[PDB]
Amino acid sequence: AGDVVTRDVNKLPVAAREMIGKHFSQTKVAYIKIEKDLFQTTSYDVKLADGIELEFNSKGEWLEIDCKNKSVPSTFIPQAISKYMKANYNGHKTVKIERNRKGYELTLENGLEVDFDQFGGFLKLSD
């Protein structure tokens, strides 16, 4: 029931391995924390050697992409959200994105968090 750490990428769901290989080929996996939540559901918290941190669900679908001081690859940002960001928070970098059943949270370099619903509708600024 305990959380485990490993360097063995064979322990990640295939979909997570593919995601990392496609989108973060500039680096590689440092370690993986395999965790159970309060629902006893497995997630994977992955540190890349360059410091990037990714989180994936039990199926290897990404939940959080944290590029620290660099921009999130744009492919991960829904089009409606990128439109909004360009119009409203132009010239700012999104350095972290998280998605959940309620929507999206984009974190800027300055630490501002911009919250959207699942449709990419703006909700609020937070942190």
What order do the helices and strands come in, and which of them pair?
Elements: E1 4-6, H1 14-23, E2 29-36, E3 42-48, E4 53-56, E5 62-66, H2 79-88, E6 94-100, E7 103-108, E8 113-116, E9 122-126
Antiparallel strand pairs: 1-2, 2-3, 3-4, 4-5, 5-6, 6-7, 7-8, 8-9
Number of strands: 9
- Give the tally of structural domains: 1
* Oligomeric state of the chains present here: monomer
Nearest-angstrom radius of gyration?
Answer: 15 Å
Class by alpha and beta content: alpha+beta
Strand content: 35-45%
Percentage of helical residues?
10-25%
Morphology: globular
- What is the CATH C level class, in words? Alpha Beta
- Which topology does CATH recognise? Inhibitor of vertebrate lysozyme, Ivy
* H/E topology pattern: EHEEEEHEEEE
Count up the helices: 2
Strand order of the largest sheet: 1-2-3-4-5-6-7-8-9
Largest β sheet strand count, sense and barrel closure: 9 strands, antiparallel
The first-to-last residue Cα distance is 31 Å
CATH structural architecture: 3-Layer(aba) Sandwich
Protein name: Putative beta-lactamase-inhibitor-like PepSY-like domain-containing protein
Keywords: Signal
Domain Putative beta-lactamase-inhibitor-like PepSY-like: 43-124
Organism: Phocaeicola vulgatus (strain ATCC 8482 / DSM 1447 / JCM 5826 / CCUG 4940 / NBRC 14291 / NCTC 11154) (Bacteroides vulgatus)
